PDB file of C-alpha atoms in Angstrom:
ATOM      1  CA  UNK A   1       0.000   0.000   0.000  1.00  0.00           C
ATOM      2  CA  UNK A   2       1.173   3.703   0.009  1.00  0.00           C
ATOM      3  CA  UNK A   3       4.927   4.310   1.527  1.00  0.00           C
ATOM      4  CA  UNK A   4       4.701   0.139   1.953  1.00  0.00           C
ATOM      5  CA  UNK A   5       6.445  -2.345  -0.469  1.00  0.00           C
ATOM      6  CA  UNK A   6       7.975  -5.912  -1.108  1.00  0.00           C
ATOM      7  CA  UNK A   7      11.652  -6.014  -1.443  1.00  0.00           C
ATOM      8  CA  UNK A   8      12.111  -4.790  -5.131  1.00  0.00           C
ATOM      9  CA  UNK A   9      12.799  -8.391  -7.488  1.00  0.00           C
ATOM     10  CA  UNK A  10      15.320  -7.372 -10.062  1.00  0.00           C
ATOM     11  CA  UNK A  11      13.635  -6.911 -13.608  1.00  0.00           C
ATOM     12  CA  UNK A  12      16.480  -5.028 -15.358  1.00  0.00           C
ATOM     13  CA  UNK A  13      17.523  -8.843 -17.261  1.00  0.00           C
ATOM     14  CA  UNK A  14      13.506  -9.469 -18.048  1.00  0.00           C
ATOM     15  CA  UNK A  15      13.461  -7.525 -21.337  1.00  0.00           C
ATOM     16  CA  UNK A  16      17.404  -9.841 -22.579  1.00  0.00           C
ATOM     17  CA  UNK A  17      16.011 -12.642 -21.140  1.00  0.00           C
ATOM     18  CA  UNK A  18      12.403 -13.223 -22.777  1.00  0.00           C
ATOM     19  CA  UNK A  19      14.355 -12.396 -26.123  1.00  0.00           C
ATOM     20  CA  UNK A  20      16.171 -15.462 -25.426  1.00  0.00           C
ATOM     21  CA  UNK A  21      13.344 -17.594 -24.734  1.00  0.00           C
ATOM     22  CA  UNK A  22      11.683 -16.586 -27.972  1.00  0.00           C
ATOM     23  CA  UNK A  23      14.570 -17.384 -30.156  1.00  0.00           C
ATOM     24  CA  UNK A  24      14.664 -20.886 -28.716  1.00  0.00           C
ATOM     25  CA  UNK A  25      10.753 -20.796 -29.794  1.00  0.00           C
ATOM     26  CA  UNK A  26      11.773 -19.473 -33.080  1.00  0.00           C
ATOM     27  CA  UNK A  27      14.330 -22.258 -33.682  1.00  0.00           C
ATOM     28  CA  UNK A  28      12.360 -25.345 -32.427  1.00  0.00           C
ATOM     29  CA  UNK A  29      11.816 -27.894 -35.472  1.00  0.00           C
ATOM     30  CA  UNK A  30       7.985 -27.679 -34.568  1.00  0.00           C
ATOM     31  CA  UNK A  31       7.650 -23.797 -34.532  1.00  0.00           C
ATOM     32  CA  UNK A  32       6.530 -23.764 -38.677  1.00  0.00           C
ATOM     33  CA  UNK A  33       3.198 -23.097 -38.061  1.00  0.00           C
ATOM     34  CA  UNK A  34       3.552 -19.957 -35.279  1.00  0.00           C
ATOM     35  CA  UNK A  35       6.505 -18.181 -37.150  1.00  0.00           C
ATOM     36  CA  UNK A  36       4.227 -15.959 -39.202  1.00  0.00           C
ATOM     37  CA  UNK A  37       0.601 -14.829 -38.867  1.00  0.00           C
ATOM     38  CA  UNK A  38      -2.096 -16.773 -40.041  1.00  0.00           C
ATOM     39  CA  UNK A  39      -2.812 -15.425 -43.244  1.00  0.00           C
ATOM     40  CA  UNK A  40      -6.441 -14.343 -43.240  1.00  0.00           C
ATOM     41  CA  UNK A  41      -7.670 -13.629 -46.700  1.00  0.00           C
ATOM     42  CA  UNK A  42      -6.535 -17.973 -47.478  1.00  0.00           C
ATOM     43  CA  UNK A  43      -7.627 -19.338 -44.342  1.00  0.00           C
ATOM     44  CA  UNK A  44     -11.577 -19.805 -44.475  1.00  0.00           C
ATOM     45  CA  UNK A  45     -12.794 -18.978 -40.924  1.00  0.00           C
ATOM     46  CA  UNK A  46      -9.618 -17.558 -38.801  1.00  0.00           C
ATOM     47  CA  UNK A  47     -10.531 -14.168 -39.053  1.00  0.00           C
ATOM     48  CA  UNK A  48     -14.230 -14.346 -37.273  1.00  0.00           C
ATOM     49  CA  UNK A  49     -13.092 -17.721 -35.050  1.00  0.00           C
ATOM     50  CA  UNK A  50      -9.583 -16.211 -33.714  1.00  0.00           C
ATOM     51  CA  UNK A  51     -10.285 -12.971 -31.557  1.00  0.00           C
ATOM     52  CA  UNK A  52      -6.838 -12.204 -31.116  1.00  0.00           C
ATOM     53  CA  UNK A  53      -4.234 -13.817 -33.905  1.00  0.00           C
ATOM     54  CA  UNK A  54      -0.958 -13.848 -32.465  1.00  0.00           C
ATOM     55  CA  UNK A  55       1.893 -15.445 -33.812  1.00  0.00           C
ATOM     56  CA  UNK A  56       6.346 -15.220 -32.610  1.00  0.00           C
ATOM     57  CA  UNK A  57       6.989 -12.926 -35.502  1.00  0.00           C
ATOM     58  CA  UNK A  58       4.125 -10.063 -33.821  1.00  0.00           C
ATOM     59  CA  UNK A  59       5.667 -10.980 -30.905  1.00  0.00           C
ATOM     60  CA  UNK A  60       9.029 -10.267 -31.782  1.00  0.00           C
ATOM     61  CA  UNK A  61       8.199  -6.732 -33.368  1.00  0.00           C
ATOM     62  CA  UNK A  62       6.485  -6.062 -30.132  1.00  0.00           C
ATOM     63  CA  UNK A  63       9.237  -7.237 -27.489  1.00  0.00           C
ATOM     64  CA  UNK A  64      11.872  -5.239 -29.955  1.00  0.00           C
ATOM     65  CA  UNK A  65       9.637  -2.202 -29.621  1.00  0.00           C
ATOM     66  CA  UNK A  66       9.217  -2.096 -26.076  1.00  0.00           C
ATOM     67  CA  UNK A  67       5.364  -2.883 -26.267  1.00  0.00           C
ATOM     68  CA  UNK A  68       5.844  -5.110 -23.025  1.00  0.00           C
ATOM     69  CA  UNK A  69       4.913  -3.650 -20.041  1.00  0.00           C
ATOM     70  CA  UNK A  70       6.273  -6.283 -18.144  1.00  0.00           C
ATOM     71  CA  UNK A  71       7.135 -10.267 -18.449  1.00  0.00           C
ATOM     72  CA  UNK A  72       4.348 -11.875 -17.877  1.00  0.00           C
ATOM     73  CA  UNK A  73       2.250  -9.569 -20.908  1.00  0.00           C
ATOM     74  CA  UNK A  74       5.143 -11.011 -22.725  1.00  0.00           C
ATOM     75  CA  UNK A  75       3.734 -14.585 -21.492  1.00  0.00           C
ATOM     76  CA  UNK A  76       0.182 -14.335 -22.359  1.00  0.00           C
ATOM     77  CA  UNK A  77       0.997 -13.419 -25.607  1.00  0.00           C
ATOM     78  CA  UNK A  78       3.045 -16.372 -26.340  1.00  0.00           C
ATOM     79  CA  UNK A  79       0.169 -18.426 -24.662  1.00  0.00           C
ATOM     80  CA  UNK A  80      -2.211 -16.689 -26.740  1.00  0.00           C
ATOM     81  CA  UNK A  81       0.015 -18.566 -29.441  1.00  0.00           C
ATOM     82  CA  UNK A  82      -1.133 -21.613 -28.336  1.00  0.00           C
ATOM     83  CA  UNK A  83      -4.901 -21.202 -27.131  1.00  0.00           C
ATOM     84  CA  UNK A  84      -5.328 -19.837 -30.882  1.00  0.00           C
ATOM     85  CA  UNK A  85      -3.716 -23.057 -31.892  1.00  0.00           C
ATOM     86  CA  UNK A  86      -6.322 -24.924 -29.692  1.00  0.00           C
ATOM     87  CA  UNK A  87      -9.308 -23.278 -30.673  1.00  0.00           C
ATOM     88  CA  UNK A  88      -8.771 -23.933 -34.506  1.00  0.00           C
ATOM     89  CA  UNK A  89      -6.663 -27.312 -34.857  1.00  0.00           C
ATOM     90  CA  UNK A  90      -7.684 -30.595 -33.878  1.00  0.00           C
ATOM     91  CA  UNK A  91      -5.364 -32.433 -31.261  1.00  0.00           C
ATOM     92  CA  UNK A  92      -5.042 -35.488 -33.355  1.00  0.00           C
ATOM     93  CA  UNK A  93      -3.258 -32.950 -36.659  1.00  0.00           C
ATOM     94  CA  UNK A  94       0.459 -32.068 -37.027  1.00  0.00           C
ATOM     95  CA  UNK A  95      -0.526 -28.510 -36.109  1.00  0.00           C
ATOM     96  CA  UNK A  96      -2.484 -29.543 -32.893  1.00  0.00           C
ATOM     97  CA  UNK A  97       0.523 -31.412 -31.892  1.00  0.00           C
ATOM     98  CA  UNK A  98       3.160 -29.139 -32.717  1.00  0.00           C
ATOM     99  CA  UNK A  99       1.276 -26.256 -30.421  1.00  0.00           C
ATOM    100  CA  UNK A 100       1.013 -28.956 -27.502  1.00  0.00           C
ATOM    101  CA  UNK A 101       4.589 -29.763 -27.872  1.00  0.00           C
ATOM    102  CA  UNK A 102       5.684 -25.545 -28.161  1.00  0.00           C
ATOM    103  CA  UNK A 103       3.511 -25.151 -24.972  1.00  0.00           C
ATOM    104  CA  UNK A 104       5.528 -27.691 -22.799  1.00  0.00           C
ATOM    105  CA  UNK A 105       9.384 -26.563 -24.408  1.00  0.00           C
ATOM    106  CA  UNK A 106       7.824 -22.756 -23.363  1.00  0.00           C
ATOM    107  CA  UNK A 107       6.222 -23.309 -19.849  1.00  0.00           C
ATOM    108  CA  UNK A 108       9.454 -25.280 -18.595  1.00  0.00           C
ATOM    109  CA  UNK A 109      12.021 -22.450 -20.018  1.00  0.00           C
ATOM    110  CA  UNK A 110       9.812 -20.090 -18.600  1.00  0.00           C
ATOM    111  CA  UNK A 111       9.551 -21.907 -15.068  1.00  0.00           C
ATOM    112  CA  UNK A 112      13.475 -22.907 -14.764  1.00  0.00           C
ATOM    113  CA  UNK A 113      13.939 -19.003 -16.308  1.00  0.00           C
ATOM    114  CA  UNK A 114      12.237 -17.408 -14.010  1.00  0.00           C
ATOM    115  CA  UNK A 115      10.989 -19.085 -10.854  1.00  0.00           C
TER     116      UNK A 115
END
């Protein structure tokens, strides 16, 4: 509350460190179908389905920017990655599995990164 505060957790690595993360997203053999955004005049439905398209290159461009507030908008965009990959892929498709398999390589680097 006012004039009270939690020791201060250094952040001043956050910014280097999700940029790291990402490019180990980038470079996994199963990132093909998140590198780019969906392109929405040639895929029948995306547009009205997915609210929010989100995809590593956007979140590149953003983290390069300085459109992150802080880590953890920095993780629910790359989850939003994978929820969007959810919503409009069947589980039992290379897609569906490739986003279940990004999900787990992200949430552990994130985890042994960070906590």
């Amino acid at each position: 509350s006012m004039s009270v505060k939690k020791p201060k957790r250094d952040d001043s690595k956050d910014l280097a460190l999700c940029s790291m993360i990402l490019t180990e997203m980038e470079t996994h053999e199963d990132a093909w179908p998140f590198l780019l955004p969906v392109n929405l005049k040639l895929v029948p439905g995306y547009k009205k389905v997915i609210k929010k398209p989100m995809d590593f290159s956007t979140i590149r461009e953003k983290l390069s920017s300085g459109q992150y507030p802080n880590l953890e908008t920095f993780a629910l965009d790359v989850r939003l990655v994978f929820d969007n990959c959810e919503t409009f892929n069947e589980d039992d498709s290379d897609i569906g599995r490739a986003g279940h398999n990004m999900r787990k390589y992200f949430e552990k680097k994130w985890t042994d990164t960070f906590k």
